[PDB]
């Protein structure tokens, strides 16, 4: 379309922390990473603007022109809410109507076709669901992704309750994207990400028993944290390749990672938003993950 492009059936849309001073134009990231799809992080509640803003403080409309330039090369975005630090819109809103108004403002500002709710903190899932019922009614072309904490012993944690609530309320669930990272008791590697995927598969089958195996895998995305994780385990380039190959084999819906600006070598084991604390060359993880899309027709 004019001001929105198709996202492939099997896509890779890594997270960009939009608040960083190092922020490049999205078109430049497309050239460097090899993907022209990104998840833009994060919209939070800003007290200053009394509504949505990047990192809860940066004007909502700041990146509109970057998104239109990305669309000129056929790229497209997913807009993410939430993340590791609040306050979330869904926490601050007094009513589902107010919450829906805020989500819709973000949709309309970016002509968004896909929203991602990266819900790490405790929330009122009922209030979220009621807002999303309004959103999907008023903006029926917009897909909803839910990006949630996960663990290889359980799959989704409290996030499972969020999906259960969405399903029962009749809120569309286009993507369930466990964050396969930061378990603390066991390392963030390919083996554990695959265990998470299998657990989430079983979880979604319980919610949606009428869906085929392939329908369930299509709903699933996986998001590791590249290189050093907050718990000091390391998701290596070898882990990345193994996970990509598993993901291709299982024809899952998507991959992403945290994060684009971390795809640079850095001092060993140091946690930073600007590098990944491993020695792999610039953009190495990006190029491996792009292979997931390439298997299914993508070329850039």
Ligand X SMILES: CC(=O)N[C@@H]1[C@H](O[C@H]2[C@H](O)[C@@H](NC(C)=O)[C@H](O[C@H]3[C@H](O)[C@@H](NC(C)=O)[C@@H](O)O[C@@H]3CO)O[C@@H]2CO)O[C@H](CO)[C@@H](O[C@@H]2O[C@H](CO)[C@@H](O)[C@H](O)[C@H]2NC(C)=O)[C@@H]1O
Binding site for ligand X (CB under 6 A): 15, 42, 83-85, 118, 120, 147, 149-151, 157, 179, 181-182, 184, 225, 230-231, 258-259, 262, 271, 273
- The CB-of-136 to Mg ion minimum distance in angstroms stands at 15
Locate 123 and state its tokens.
């929330």
As measured in angstroms, the least distance from the Cβ of 181 to ligand X is 6
Q: How far is the CB of 94 from Mg ion (least distance, A)?
A: 14
Of residues 27 and 84, the one with the C-beta less far from ligand X = 84
Which residues, other chains included, contact 168 with Cβ-Cβ below 8 Å and sequence gap of 6+?
none
Nearer to ligand X, 200 or 225 (CB): 225
- Residues 6 or more apart whose CB falls under 8 angstroms from that of 81 comprise 42, 43, 44, 52, 88, 89, 90, 103, 106, 115, 116, 117, 118
Query: What does 71 bind: ligand X, Mg ion, none (CB cut-off 5 to 8 Å by kind)?
Result: none
Residue 88's binding partner out of ligand X, Mg ion, none, with CB under 5 to 8 Å set by partner kind? Mg ion
Q: Which does 90 bind (CB under 5 to 8 A by kind): Mg ion, ligand X, none?
A: Mg ion
For ligand X, the closer CB: 15 or 102 = 15
Contact flag: residue 88 with Mg ion (CB under 5 A) = yes
Looking at the Cβ atoms of 90 and 252, the one nearer to Mg ion is 90
Q: Which two tokens stand for residue 81?
A: 């809410």
> Of 77, 90, 216, 247, which lies in the binding site for Mg ion, with binding defined by CB under 5 A?
90
294 binds, among ligand X, Mg ion, none (CB under 5 to 8 A by kind): none
- Single out the segment in contact with Mg ion by CB under 5 A; choices: 17-25, 87-95, 184-192, 239-247: 87-95
Q: Could you give the CA distance from residue 259 to residue 274 in angstroms, rounded to a whole number?
A: 9
Contacts 24+ apart (CB under 8 A), 259-264: 259/14, 259/15, 259/16, 259/17, 259/41, 259/225, 259/226, 260/14, 260/15, 260/16, 260/17, 260/29, 260/33, 260/38, 260/286, 261/16, 261/17, 261/20, 261/22, 261/23, 262/226, 262/227, 263/33, 263/226
**Residue 62 beta carbon to ligand X: minimum distance, rounded to whole angstroms:** 17
Please report, as residue ranges, which positions from 42 to 81 form the binding site for Mg ion (by CB under 5 A): 81
Residue whose CB is less far from ligand X, 49 or 184 = 184
Give the angle subtended at the CA of 225 by the CAs of 290 and 263, to the nearest 5°.
55
Q: How far is the CB of 259 from ligand X (least distance, A)?
A: 6
Task: State the burial class of residue 254 (Cβ atoms within 10 Å of its Cβ: 0-12, 13-18, 19+).
Answer: buried
Residue 123 or 190: which CB sits closer to Mg ion? 123
What angle do helix axes 284-294 and 26-33 make, rounded to 10 degrees? 80
For Mg ion, the binding residues (CB under 5 A) are: 81, 88-90
């Amino acid at each position: 379309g004019p001001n929105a492009n198709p996202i492939p059936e099997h896509f890779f849309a890594p997270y960009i922390d939009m608040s960083l001073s190092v922020h490049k134009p999205l078109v430049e990231y497309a050239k460097l990473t090899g993907t022209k799809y990104f998840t833009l992080a994060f919209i939070l509640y800003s007290s200053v603007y009394n509504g949505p803003a990047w990192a809860g403080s940066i004007p909502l409309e700041k990146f509109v022109d970057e998104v239109r330039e990305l669309r000129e090369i056929g790229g497209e975005v997913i807009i993410a809410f939430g993340g590791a630090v609040g306050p979330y819109l869904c926490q601050q809103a007094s009513t589902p109507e107010q919450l829906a108004e805020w989500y819709i403002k973000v949709i309309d500002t970016y002509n968004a076709t896909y929203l991602d709710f990266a819900i790490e903190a405790g929330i009122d899932a009922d209030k979220l669901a009621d807002a999303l019922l309004i959103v999907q009614r008023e903006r029926p072309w917009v897909k909803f992704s839910f990006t949630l904490p996960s663990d290889p012993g359980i799959g989704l944690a409290g996030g499972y309750g969020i999906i259960e609530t969405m399903a029962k309320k009749g809120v569309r669930v286009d993507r369930v994207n466990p964050m396969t990272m930061d378990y603390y008791w066991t390392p963030s590697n390919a083996e554990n990400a695959i265990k998470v995927a299998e657990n989430v598969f079983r979880q979604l089958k319980q919610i949606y028993p009428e869906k085929s195996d392939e329908e369930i895998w299509k709903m699933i995305g996986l998001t590791p944290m590249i290189g050093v994780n907050d718990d000091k385990s390391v998701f290596t380039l070898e882990d990345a390749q193994q996970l990509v190959d598993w993901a291709i084999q299982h024809k899952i819906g998507s991959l992403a990672f945290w994060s684009v600006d971390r795809d640079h070598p850095g001092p060993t084991g140091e946690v930073s938003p600007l590098h990944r604390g491993t020695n792999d060359p610039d953009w190495a993880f990006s190029h491996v993950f792009v292979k997931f899309m390439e298997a299914f027709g993508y070329t850039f």
